[PDB]
Design a protein around this ligand. Structure first.
Ligand SMILES: OC[C@H]1O[C@@H](O)[C@H](O)[C@@H](O[C@@H]2O[C@H]3CO[C@@H]([C@@H]2O)[C@@H]3O[C@@H]2O[C@H](CO)[C@H](O)[C@H](O[C@@H]3O[C@H]4CO[C@@H]([C@@H]3O)[C@@H]4O)[C@H]2O)[C@H]1O
Ligand SMILES: [Ca+2]
Ligand SMILES: [Ca+2]
Length: 750
């Protein structure tokens, strides 16, 4: 309990705690130890405001440099009907920040801690700036000691702050659908207990489950797995919810023009899809209906001469490739690259074991302790355990059939993004198709290109690649009426919302480059010459003194120029031209090979939707797609949709919990499985209420691997099914409740 910062026992709201869209007071409540105590009650006006919370800002930064192995603790409980996800941001005197987050249930108050130093922060990650994981290759670790306190979950930022000056501690609730209220008490620093040197050892049992924790629903033997199977199989009969048309549209509603394909139409002031037969349609369903992302790095590697190399022409990025069948020749050369990874697994099969076919090999990774290596899919292994093999790979066919039966039973109207192409002829439930434009075209920088530099969309090779991407999608979907539409790409790093530098990173970086060999720079220069005509008019506009356009075309540093209204207008126009060109080229390619199908945009995240780029999508995309990892769609955040007046779709959302073995709930956190389901209905209700949305897909079908998906270490409870391929009943029930009213509520009387 070493160092108490705030116990509120002096009955005052400290004046160095600042509050935003929240009321604070001191109240008596029953604390952890059973005794009455003074605590801070914080009532956030989070239904009305998309940012609320407190910020502790001491007059001088705290000097905690003596605490070389210590954590910051809070006692927290939610009050009322709703759990609370708090974002903890701690900022030091050099501006460096980390973010952690956790759910705060209603009910019994607990202690929560955020490491400041020591243990699994000591060697924090791989040293790569884009690696958000801990050194283990997990996005957030199990705790480094045993206790009743709850560890705030790692999200992103700097692992090792300058403890000689901590400048701000922030707790916030963001984009909520409801007012949230908490009591906070006993804000303190405690030295860390000794590190448990086994904390990363023996994490995973043979089913891929958390080995050390026995939770409700955990599988303890093959027989229990088969029992869960048989119970589910007896209930799945292939029957869609009542009053669905053939393509999952609404039978009981207006019947509109039938074109033979999914299309868009505004119905009584609300955007809808319309299915090939003319019935109103609203898209619900799950992303990642595939096994590509279900494998986890085992810590072994192969002799490179034994591994097939990637073709330069492949349209599929490594993260979305099928699980790679590992040969005997490769497996013979198996050696240990990460002792830390390898010691995580209580069981991996020998080359000759019947489950050894669920090995995978990844030739790259976005982040983690390994750049490449062997991986294993426990989920895939469990499909073999559940369904057996009556000819090679038969459990996969059975998986796909059970998957479509599930979606129909659960009331979903579609298979979501990243559905394996083997579902494309299921001819029982519609699906969404996808492609990625990748290749060797030139690139530009935005300043935040965490997944690779942005495409130079004016390079003719970009268009050659987009056409190849669309050709392959068209080949896959076979012009099917079951295909709702095509997503291309995902969350491209167009710009970030922080600042002018962040928003206009593409214009700014690009203007800095010479025109020669840079097609986007050439297009920007061409646009500025058309607007201004003369170098003197440009000089006047930007406050510069270039001698000529030729000097301008050697590259101009605009980083230190203050952003006048004139300068912002040129940056805005440049970003618009760039986004217009991206969308023109992708739209054109999709239209060329798939003239009948909806083009669904590029899936803008919350952090990557500058208005220039949205307006460009709205011009070319039939439906504008957004990813939104929030508790819902707040009113003010989405009010801009009315001006665009385009049908829109949520590509991705989720809510996770940690009561089913996971070390990380995911991006948005619930107090339990039940609370996950409640939060799902809250999110979906906001989608259903918004007249611009024609659907929302949940990311993803299955939990990520406990020890992290191979690509980048995400280890989240974000599935409708767990690693044993067993449904979370609470999500199933929430989905049924939601899917039963999508049509009646949206289209009905009020
Ligand atoms: O430090 C960067 C961070 O900045 C913070 O401000 C952001 O809020 C963080 O946002 C996140 O950015 C990424 C990673 O998590 C999601 C969150 O918005 C964004 O990604 C998508 O969401 C899920 C999360 O479970 C996956 O990461 C998903 O990744 C895809 O999965 C499959 C299909 O396509 C690829 C792709 O990686 C893979 O094969 C993302 O769509 C953060 O930006
Ligand atoms: Ca107290
Ligand atoms: Ca993966």
């Amino acid at each position: 309990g070493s160092h108490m910062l705030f116990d509120f026992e002096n009955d005052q709201v400290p004046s160095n705690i600042h509050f935003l869209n929240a009321r604070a007071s001191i109240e008596t409540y029953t604390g952890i130890n059973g005794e009455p105590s003074k605590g801070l009650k914080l009532a956030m006006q989070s239904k009305q405001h998309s940012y609320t919370g407190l910020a502790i800002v001491p007059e001088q930064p705290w000097d905690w440099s003596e605490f070389t192995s210590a954590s910051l603790y809070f006692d927290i409980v939610s009050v009322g009907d709703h759990s609370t996800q708090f974002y903890l941001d701690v900022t030091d005197q050099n501006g460096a920040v980390f973010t952690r987050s956790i759910d705060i249930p209603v009910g019994k108050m607990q202690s929560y801690y955020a490491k400041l130093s020591g243990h699994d922060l000591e060697v924090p990650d791989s040293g790569d700036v884009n690696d958000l994981n801990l050194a283990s290759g997990l996005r957030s670790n199990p705790p480094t000691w045993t206790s009743d306190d709850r560890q705030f979950v790692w999200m992103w930022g700097v692992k090792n702050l300058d403890l000689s000056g901590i400048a701000k501690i922030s707790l916030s609730v963001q984009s909520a659908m409801h007012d949230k209220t908490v009591i906070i008490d006993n804000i303190r620093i405690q030295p860390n207990p000794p590190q448990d040197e086994n904390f990363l050892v023996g994490l995973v049992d043979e089913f891929g489950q958390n080995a050390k924790v026995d939770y409700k629903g955990k599988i303890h033997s093959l027989e229990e797995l088969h029992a869960a199977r048989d119970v589910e199989l007896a209930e799945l009969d292939g029957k869609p919810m009542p009053s669905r048309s053939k393509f999952g549209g609404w039978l009981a509603g207006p019947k509109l023009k039938a074109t033979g394909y999914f299309r868009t139409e505004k119905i009584n002031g609300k955007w809808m899809l319309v299915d090939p037969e003319g019935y109103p349609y609203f898209a619900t369903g799950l992303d990642i209906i595939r096994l590509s992302n279900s494998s986890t790095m085992t810590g072994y590697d192969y002799d490179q001469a034994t591994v097939a190399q990637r073709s330069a022409d492949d349209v599929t990025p490594e993260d979305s490739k099928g699980l790679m069948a590992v040969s005997e020749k490769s497996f013979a050369t198996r050696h240990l690259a990460s002792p830390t990874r390898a010691a995580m697994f209580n069981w991996l099969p020998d080359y000759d074991h019947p489950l050894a076919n669920h090995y995978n090999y990844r030739r790259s990774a976005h982040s983690g302790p390994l750049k490449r290596g062997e991986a294993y899919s426990f989920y895939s292994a469990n499909l073999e355990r559940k369904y057996g093999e009556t000819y090679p790979g038969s459990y996969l066919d059975k998986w796909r059939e059970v998957t479509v039966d599930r979606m129909l039973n659960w009331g979903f109207t579609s298979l979501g993004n990243w559905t394996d192409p083997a579902y494309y002829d299921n001819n029982r439930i519609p699906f969404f198709a996808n492609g990625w434009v990748i290749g060797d075209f030139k690139t530009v920088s935005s300043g935040a290109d965490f997944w690779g530099a942005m495409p130079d969309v004016f390079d003719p090779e970009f268009k050659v690649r987009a056409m190849e991407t669309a050709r392959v999608v068209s080949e896959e979907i076979k012009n099917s009426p079951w295909c709702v539409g095509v997503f291309i790409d995902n969350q491209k790093s167009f710009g970030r919302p922080d600042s002018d530098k962040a928003q206009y990173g593409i214009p700014i970086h690009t203007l800095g480059r010479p025109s020669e060999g840079v097609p986007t720079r050439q297009a920007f220069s061409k646009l500025l010459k058309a607007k201004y005509k003369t170098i003197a008019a440009l000089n006047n506009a930007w406050g510069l003194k270039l001698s000529s356009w030729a000097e301008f075309d050697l590259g101009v540093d605009v980083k230190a120029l203050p952003v006048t209204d004139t300068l912002r207008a040129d940056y805005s126009m440049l970003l618009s031209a760039y986004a217009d060109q991206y969308f023109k080229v992708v739209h054109g390619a999709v239209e060329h090979y798939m003239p009948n199908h909806l083009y669904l945009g590029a899936r803008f995240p919350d952090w990557g939707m500058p208005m220039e780029v949205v307006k460009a999508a709205a011009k070319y995309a039939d439906v504008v797609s957004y990813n939104s990892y929030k508790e819902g769609l707040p009113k003010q955040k989405w009010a801009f949709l009315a001006e665009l007046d385009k049908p829109s779709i949520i590509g991705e959302f989720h809510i996770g919990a940690m009561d089913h073995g996971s070390y990380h709930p995911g991006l948005i956190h619930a107090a339990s499985q039940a609370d996950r389901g409640e939060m799902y209905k809250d999110y979906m209700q906001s989608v259903i209420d918004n007249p611009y949305f024609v659907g929302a897909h949940w990311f993803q079908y299955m939990d990520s691997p406990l020890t992290g998906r191979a690509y980048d270490g995400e280890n989240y409870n974000v599935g409708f099914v767990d690693v044993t391929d067993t449904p979370y009943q609470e999500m199933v029930d929430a989905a049924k409740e939601v899917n039963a009213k999508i049509y009646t509520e949206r289209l009905g009387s009020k």
